[PDB]
Amino acid sequence: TEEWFAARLGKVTASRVADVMTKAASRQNYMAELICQRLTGTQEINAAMQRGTELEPHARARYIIETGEIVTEVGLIDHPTIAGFGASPDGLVGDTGLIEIKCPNTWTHIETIKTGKPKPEYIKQMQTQMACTGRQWCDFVSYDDRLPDDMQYFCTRIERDDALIAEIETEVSAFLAELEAEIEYLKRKAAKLA
Amino acid sequence: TEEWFAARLGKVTASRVADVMTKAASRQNYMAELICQRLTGTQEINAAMQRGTELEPHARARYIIETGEIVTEVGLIDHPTIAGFGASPDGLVGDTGLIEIKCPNTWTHIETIKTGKPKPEYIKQMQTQMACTGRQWCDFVSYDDRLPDDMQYFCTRIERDDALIAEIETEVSAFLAELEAEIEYLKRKAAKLA
Amino acid sequence: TEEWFAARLGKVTASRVADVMTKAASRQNYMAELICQRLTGTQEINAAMQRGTELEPHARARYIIETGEIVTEVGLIDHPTIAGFGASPDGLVGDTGLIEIKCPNTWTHIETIKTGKPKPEYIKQMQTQMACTGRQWCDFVSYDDRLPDDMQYFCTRIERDDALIAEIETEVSAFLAELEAEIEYLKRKAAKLA
DNA sequence: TTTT
DNA sequence: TTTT
DNA sequence: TTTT
Ligand SMILES: [Mg+2]
Ligand SMILES: [Mg+2]
Ligand SMILES: [Mg+2]
Ligand SMILES: [Mg+2]
Ligand SMILES: [Mg+2]
Ligand SMILES: [Mg+2]
After folding, report:
1. C172: which of A5, A121, B15, C93 is 20 to 30 A away, CA to CA?
2. Interface membership of C113 toward A (CB under 8 Å)
């Protein structure tokens, strides 16, 4: 989608927030990606991933057939105050809502139905979208058409949690500080080295 | 092979028996596959796997050149009594025998020769084939033509073990019970939910 | 490159030395590869690997633009005394030097710059090249053009270490002894078996 | 961002 | 079912 | 040998 990758280069984004905040390898590996993005000026690049992608509009439609909500697609929404940070929600719902859509493996979809509550990393994803957009709630949608009709669609609403947001902004600010510093640090070793 | 996948949909089968019976992740992941098969009405889908497949008839021939046995290819043989359970032996040998063929990685083949006894998961595979067909023995064949002639072929006979069979049928019955129930359970949550 | 694989069949080589010498799975898996190579008469066969390969000549050039050294490309150099053992340096530098080139993932390249010292497995690689060729030093080069100019190139010299070489030759001799024996052992079981 |  |  |  080209112009959009450009808006994401070297930025922390909602779908990567669990990695930032994990108590671990994934935090440093993510840090390493973004360091490389900022330095090199571009990014790097499966079958289940490829379905989640094609079937996304199918779910967007379904959410509407089910709710009658007015849904606007948007690009990257930069955090209001924190620089180098943003979100790409799957939709603006109404005046104060959002939609985040998954179209995963059937068994995953089943477990979401089984438990009624989305995985904690998606909580972090959704809270961050809310932080970035100032929205009040996000409707979490899981879709899979391979199943019987009465099992294809699941929705659950997730309320903005200002406490969790405050933490995230702390952690993301911390993580961003290290990241900038690290780049700085490297630029200064390499340059003196002339 | 189309019509055959149909005979396997949502069924426990001989080659998956070690997963059922393991003391673990693989049991639940298998359970999850079959739950999804039954619900969705279809299945999901490497280089060593691709050889084992092409070279299989090469081994079938070799077994005959070596034994002079009369070998009949068959499809899925449903367990005589337990429903949703079956086997696909690589052959009916004689009136009371079977053949199960592997054409693995050379080093694997070498280890089979080194030890003379097939991996325990293939024991379970073969016992199950015997359970399903009522046969008396299975000739386990390992083949690899990449090696010198005097190392390409290995055969060892495995006698029906009624004790092990009894266990398997217990475990598979248990596992099937959970599987049906789980589907049932899900169908009833989803349906009341209307 | 065909004629070169032929010179490597069933041989221990510099880039596999860390596997030989590890205190582990990788030693036996390597042993297994070479056993299979010798027995079958051939070998088995990603995106980062594919770059390291294309970009190698780019680095060779750069090393020269930076040093003005006279660099000769060579094939496999068999150890002077130990049979079934060899090295493929990325270059003969001068009369007494070598070059070993990496063109890895950016982040890896960055860590090499960060620490100034190559990973211990490359130490083993380079020492072995020196053992095989009798050279006095190897210039370790890490290259990545995706980065800013002042970060693309890193070089560090590694001096021949006769102590480490002596060990390697012991370990490789040991490992080779087992490997020959194992083949022997197998040939004799299989052959009596006639 | 896309799925585990 | 196909190989680890 | 090529990268982790
Ligand atoms: Mg999104
Ligand atoms: Mg989504
Ligand atoms: Mg079979
Ligand atoms: Mg088979
Ligand atoms: Mg080399
Ligand atoms: Mg190299």
Report:
1. C93
2. yes
Which top CATH class is C1-194? alpha beta
Q: Where are the alpha helices (DSSP H) in chain A?
A: 3-8, 17-20, 25-40, 47-54, 56-67, 106-115, 120-133, 149-152, 162-192
Please tell me whether residue A95 adopts helix, strand or coil conformation: coil
Per-residue tokens: A161: 């949690």
Give the number of whichever ligand sits closest to the CA of residue C101. 6
Question: DSSP secondary structure string, chain C?
Answer: -THHHHHHTT-EEGGGHHHHT---HHHHHHHHHHHHHHHHS-----HHHHHHHHTHHHHHHHHHHHH---EE----EE-SSSTTEEE--SEEETTTEEEEEE---HHHHHHHHHHSS--HHHHHHHHHHHHHH--SEEEEEEE-TTS-HHHHEEEEEEE--HHHHHHHHHHHHHHHHHHHHHHHHHHHHHHHT-
Other C-beta atoms within 10 Å of C109: how many? Answer: 22
- Closest nucleotide (C1' vs CA) to B1 is E1
A91 neighbors A60 (Cβ within 8 angstroms): yes
Residues C107, A43 contacting (CB under 8 angstroms): no
Q: Are B98 and B135 in contact (CB under 8 A)?
A: yes
Partner residue opposite C151 with nearest CB, options A32, A33, A190? A190
The rounded distance, in Å, linking the Cα atoms of A21 and A124 is 9
* Strand positions, DSSP E, B126-179: 137-143, 153-159
Q: Which chains does B contact via 3+ CB–CB distances below 8 A?
A: A, C
The pair of three-digit structure tokens given for residue C4, joined into one six-digit string: 């070169």
C107 contacts A194? CB cut-off 8 A: no
Structure-token match 């510093």, residue found: A181
- Spell out a b/e string for B51-78, using b for 16 or more CB atoms within 10 Å of the CB, else e: bbeebbeebbebbeeebeeebeeeebbb
Residue B41's closest CA among A145, C24, A94? A145
Method of elucidation: X-ray
Q: Tell me if chain B has a CB within 8 Å of the CB of A149.
A: no
Q: Are A8 and A172 in contact (CB under 8 A)?
A: no
Half-sphere exposure of C136 toward its Cβ, with a 13 Å CA cutoff? 5
Helices B25-40 & A106-115 angle (0-180, nearest 10): 100
Q: Is A39–C107 a contact, with Cβ atoms under 8 angstroms apart?
A: no
> Are B148 and C36 a contacting pair at CB < 8 A?
no
Domain boundary assignment for chain B: 1-194
- Distance in Å, alpha carbon of A54 to nearest chain B alpha carbon: 18
- C19 contacts C128 by C-beta, under 8 angstroms: no
Q: Does A39 touch chain C (CB under 8 A)?
A: yes
Residue-level length of chain C: 194
Task: Choose among A72, A179, A53, A64: nearest CA to A135.
Answer: A72
